[PDB]
Amino acid sequence: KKIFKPEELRQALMPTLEALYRQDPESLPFRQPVDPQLLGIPDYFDIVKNPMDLSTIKRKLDTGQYQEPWQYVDDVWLMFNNAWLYNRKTSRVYKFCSKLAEVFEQEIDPVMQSLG
Amino acid sequence: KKIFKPEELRQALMPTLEALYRQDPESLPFRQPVDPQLLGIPDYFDIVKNPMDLSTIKRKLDTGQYQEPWQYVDDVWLMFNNAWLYNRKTSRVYKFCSKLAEVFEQEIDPVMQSLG
Ligand SMILES: Cc1noc(C)c1-c1ccc2c(c1)nc([C@@H]1CCCC(=O)N1)n2[C@H]1CC[C@@H](NC(=O)OC(C)(C)C)CC1
Ligand SMILES: Cc1noc(C)c1-c1ccc2c(c1)nc([C@@H]1CCCC(=O)N1)n2[C@H]1CC[C@@H](NC(=O)OC(C)(C)C)CC1
Ligand SMILES: [Mg+2]
């Protein structure tokens, strides 16, 4: 039944995104979209058909593109699954992604309990 | 008596797993282990005694846990059989599983032929 007010969603959810940004160095690969030309990885978009990154999620929060909090959680989880799929378990970026996922899991659980 | 090296298997088999990940929305329930507490299905682990999902399979490919290609195929097929067993034929999840199974059959057929 409930309609989420855009600023209510933004206020509840942005602290969880801000917690990811504070992770340095782990958030740095995730602060802007993956650029396969800069990185020299022409197969990236062969494998990742739905790219996502922190700046895109932040812009969707700013502009009211999320109707309900699970749409935001789905984008954060998509971001992580893209990096875990494309990069090997031993790689730096994969370990960075796991650290962000660890932080996100700790932040998001009490927030979603209070929203639903 | 051919020996299959970890990286050899990974290069051959990873594309077939990547093809499943590309299916959206159908791969989304399969990208992480089933969480019966999150989903509110407490009998899940009564029926599924050997859970399996894409992220676990990907990890086993990354870490060399498959000795031969059929061990990978067996895990993908276990994944599917778990979903078809637990969910009814008319359910969304079951239909999503069938879609992944159709993609997998098309992708694995030539790969297995080239490996043997
Ligand atoms: C995620 C992901 N998933 O797969 C992959 C693959 C990634 C991913 C993405 C970015 C990565 C990254 C891995 N490795 C690094 C760096 C550089 C190379 C290797 C290294 O060791 N450290 N970067 C940086 C690239 C550009 C930087 N900023 C940026 O573009 O500055 C402007 C001014 C706008 C030009 C910041 C981040
Ligand atoms: C397979 C299978 N076999 O039996 C069953 C049963 C499944 C199965 C499994 C997952 C399912 C699923 C069915 N239905 C959905 C969604 C939500 C439920 C209602 C719906 O209509 N669609 N999900 C999602 C659950 C959580 C999602 N992500 C996730 O955990 O995010 C973090 C951040 C880590 C918390 C991704 C997938
Ligand atoms: Mg953990």
Numbering used by the authors:
A (entry chain B), B (entry chain A): 1082 to 1197
Task: Provide the authors' own sentences about this structure as they appear in the paper.
The resultant compounds displayed a >1000-fold loss of affinity for EP300 and CBP. A co-crystal structure of the CBP bromodomain with compound 1 demonstrated that the side chain R1173 is more flexible than in co-crystal structures with CCS1477 and assumes a conformation incompatible for hydrogen-bonding with the piperidinone oxygen, while weakly interacting with a nitrogen of the benzimidazole core. Therefore, loss of Pi-cation as well as hydrogen-bonding interactions renders compounds 1 and 2 less efficient binders to EP300 and CBP. Notably, activity against BRD4 was reduced by ~10-fold, indicating that the hydrophobic van-der-Waals (VDW) interactions observed between the difluorophenyl moiety of CCS1477 and the WPF shelf of BRD4 contribute to binding affinity, but relatively less so in the EP300/CBP bromodomain. To further evaluate the specific effects of CCS1477-int(1) as a case example, we performed further CellTiter-Glo dose-response growth assays in HDMB03 and MB002 G3MB cells, demonstrating a blunting of anti-growth effect in cells treated with CCS1477-int(1), as compared with CCS1477. Thus, the difluorophenyl group is a critical moiety in the CCS1477 pharmacophore that facilitates potent interaction with the bromodomain of EP300/CBP and is required for efficacy in cell line models of G3MB.
